[PDB]
Symmetry: C6
Subunit: 258 residues, 6 copies
């Protein structure tokens, strides 16, 4: 899915709009935390029936969310044959101590991370994909930027550690195998694709995150709240593809509406 | 009651539905302590008459709740011949320093615990069943998960202890007899059934708690707030029973409604 | 002046009900003091006329309250020839430093106590009767239970002291003659009757406090807010009398309604 | 005015009721702080015209209040020829550092005090009369009782000081001449009459304060808020006169109304 | 302006009334900073036109206010030829670190001070008149009293200082030249007129501040909220003038109305 | 690109007004950012169409804002060929750690600064223009005054340092090349123009900031909320030009109305 955009969709018809806009995948979900976050309610896995109905409407990959640590929700979502599971901090966590043991699943998982240690812990548990934790709901791209900058800075700082022994002390504080940390230092990158998520509101934001080194970007239901969802979704996809072409980012950002 | 679901019920007709659904017992209570607690009211044992009308309505075992330390509520419930007494922290505690001397009753009790010490203190006092404390009323399964996981971890961590004198110190910090803590450590688990309670909202939640090693689960008045109580109650029972079978978990979770 | 039940009454008709239910005394009151503290209001001695009108309506003993330290209220209530004066912390205290000098009155006094020192100081000042303090208004029995348990536990611990100098040092911290503390330690109990008050809402609550060793129980206007007064008042009296009989406790507690 | 009652009056007709009830004096004032205290407004000297109108309506002495430190209000009230000036903490203070220099006036002043040092400072500035500071507005007689007890205890404690040198240290901390403190110790009383004021709501309260050694008592507009002001005012006067006659305090307290 | 009253005025017609009443000057301001400050608004210099219409309406001196540090508001007011500029803390400060360099203007300024240091700093910067700060808008005269009394006391306490080097240290702590502080101490008072302001509500208040040694008094829009502005304004003027004559103070204070 | 006045404009018609009043540039904006922060809202780059429509309506230079760190917004606004880009703290910052690398753009940038370090860091990153930060929205000029005074005062104090090592230590704490700090110390000023922004509400405010040494002044949409826009905008321009002429400042400030 590298170079691509994943969109949150709440109905089959939204999925079809996502797919026709250029999305590489869709993320099926009932609500969009938010309306529930400001309310108080527990956020859980969405009904399998609404997910299958989305899977039946497009021919691109479909992802779905489960609660952090909720390995039973994950077993149900795997049995449904979705393409990816997003063990998501947007939903209400089920286990505040243990993430899901992802290497016991066939289906790939994406997890969030706000820094290097977090990202390595998620990968060491078996995450196949990392995304920034962003700041979901708000439309403020700055948390996404903070987290991508932080991982990049931390990687660079580790790379200046001379002692193999100091490196080990770091792996220890992160609670990951030294081999995993060492593999990151030698490649100067996480060993899995890293996508931006949380606060990506405009085409500019999308191109920003790509220019900071993200392999792609998730966008939320904000696309569909806008006065023309097709124009906005197509504009974010173009911007993600042509992320280093100012005249084209200019063209796709012009006259977008509210 | 191993491998079962116990359901809170506030009417004879609710109790009948629980029984048709496959519940192994019901808990008779005049009103969930999640409505009035908001208003600031003392929650006590229910009227023996409404407990008796529930008992007359089903042939599965009936439980009832008394306040913590309220051994006279318990004598009264015992004389009524309910099958189990729940000394419950959901009710307003009658004695904040002493729980009931349960080993002086001939009806079995269940008690809450959030960790090992707590479980062992309740067992020492004569509890025949333990249940996690979790968060009653929120529908958030994470408090139940925290407590089962805390108990499991404390057992493991006490199992690591080399010195008999240190084991004895732990028993002392717990205010229980060493021979009780010793027997827990030898067996690797609590000497009575342990049920999850508080926050168990979906079939997936019930199966999560069973795969964490609970022997069964309490569910609250939430069953009866759903559009189809019969469907939800049946689905929770089937998930508790087939707790390690994903395809079955998928099927009972699909098209679950409000 | 032994055990039984004393009921707060606000009219001659309530007293008549208290009497025919089997109360051993009444406590004449012009208002329920929960209503008024809420207001902000000062609660004082009741108007002598309304106390007198209650005195005329029943042949069992009548008590009335005065504010802590208000010895002129007590001079007036004594002249009225009530049977007991209750120097009561439910009223607004008149003197935060000095309780009334009760040994100067012919009429006997009841005072509240939350621990052993307080009880001995009230007895030392001439109280003829102690009541546990409880939490008045709330219908929550746990404050009464706390205080009865506190007093008991403090007697038991003072009983462990082997040195007479240490016993004297305890008496002195309590501000009471050592011969008074010494008598309690030898006999295992206060030298006057001790009643539970504050939060006795149900027949089970009355019988709980008697099983904890109280000699009797004050009950508030809560009896008269109930759906059926005679029936609740009679149940509380029966439970106070038969405090040790589970099946009778069951019978009087069933179908009590609001 | 010793043995007497001073009443607050807001109209000539109230003054006439005060006088016919037995008051030894009246205190002329526009408002009764309160309604203004809970509001926020500055309390000041009352209009001279409303004061003269009261002075013209009765033949007993009339007092009036000025703000603490407001020696100009005092000069205006003196020129009006009132009988006593009450430099009053009920009004909004004008000088938080300096009370009025009362010895530069012909008219006598009364001042409040909550303890011995305060009372000596007020007398040393030239106060001819002391009253307790009470807790005005509330009807709670307990602040009045606290303050009279405190002065009495402090006097007694000073009287146990052996060293003339320690006595001097005390005068120094109080900021008064040692001769003044010494005169109090030798007489065992303040050298001026001391009246209770603040919270005297009933005849019992009035008789209480007299039995604690006060030379008289001020009562507020509460008399006139009652359903029969004449009965209540006459009852407080009787009670102040017959302060040690229980059967008469009983008779005057009976059937008083709200 | 010694021995006079300066009155806040918001219209030409208010100004005329102040002038008939005997005011020595008026202060033109478009709206008292006690209405909007509540709303959270920036209060600035008034429109020069409304200041000019006031100036055209009376032949007594007209003052106007500028923000603290706003030397350009002051240049503008100066070009308008008002008679005095009030650099006022009632307005919203333009420069929280530097007041205006007043000795560079040719129109006299007045400035607030709450103590000596403050007065001397304002004088050093070129203020021709000082006024107490007190509490604008409350009608509480005690802040004005506190400040006049604080200044008087600090002068006395500095007069006690024996060492020229210690005097110099004080001047240094004040951030003013020693020769200025020295001249204050020799003369026993501030080298310019000092007026009371903020809280001056009654004739009695105005005379209080004069007997404390003020040279005159500012009164605010409160004159014009009274039922009879003409009567109140005249009465304050007469009391400022005859500030040490009780019978006259009595007469102007009698029958003053709302 | 020297001094004068830059006005925020939200429509082509406002720009036309800004131009004919004598503004030296406009700042194209689709909303007033005080309205939106209040909402909670993220403020971003404005839609290129509306900026373009403003560019078409006037022949004076047009600026637009981008979020701090949002270099892709700046890439887009540059492609649009606006005349200046303002990297603006009034918008929601995109990168809390890294301002844009402005020396990589051909279009010149304006940045905010509240002190000398911040100004040098923005210049070091390639800013062509500094503006003081002020408090935007409030109409209160004191934050702008504070920042202009701060920068000045810090230059003057760095000027006192006699040691080159100490000067280097200052540069390093500021995170800027020592040759940059050294140039400011020698010349007594920033090497680029410095404009006041934030809180410039009145003609007097504009002229105040110019007299404090600013080279120009940004003004907000506050001009357009006023009762007469042309007149207020022209007065601000005239005051910025004639900042040193009191009588002209008087003339343009008079009868400005709402």
């Amino acid at each position: 899915l590298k170079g691509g955009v994943i969109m949150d969709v709440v109905t089959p018809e939204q999925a079809k709009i996502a797919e026709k806009s250029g999305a590489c995948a869709v993320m099926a979900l009932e609500s969009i935390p938010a309306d529930m976050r400001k309310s108080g309610k527990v956020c859980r896995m969405s009904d399998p029936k609404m997910i299958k109905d989305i899977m039946n409407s497009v021919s691109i990959p479909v992802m779905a969310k489960v609660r952090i640590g909720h390995f039973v929700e994950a077993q149900i979502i795997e049995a449904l044959e979705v393409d990816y599971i997003d063990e998501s901090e947007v939903l209400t966590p089920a286990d505040w101590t243990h993430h899901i043991e992802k290497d016991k699943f066939k289906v790939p998982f994406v997890c969030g991370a706000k820094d290097l240690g977090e990202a390595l812990r998620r990968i060491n548990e078996g995450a196949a994909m990392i995304r920034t934790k962003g700041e979901a709901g708000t439309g403020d791209v700055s948390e996404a930027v903070k987290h991508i900058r932080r991982i990049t800075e931390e990687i660079k700082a580790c790379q200046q550690l001379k002692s193999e022994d100091d490196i080990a002390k770091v792996a220890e504080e992160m609670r990951v195998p030294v081999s995993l940390l060492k593999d990151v230092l030698e490649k100067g990158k996480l060993p899995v694709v890293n996508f931006a998520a949380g606060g990506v509101a405009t085409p500019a934001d999308a191109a920003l995150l790509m220019q900071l080194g993200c392999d792609g970007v998730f966008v939320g239901s904000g696309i569909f709240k806008s006065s023309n969802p097709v124009r906005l979704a197509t504009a974010v996809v173009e911007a993600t593809t042509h992320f280093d072409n100012p005249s084209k980012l200019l063209e796709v950002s012009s006259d977008l509406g509210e």
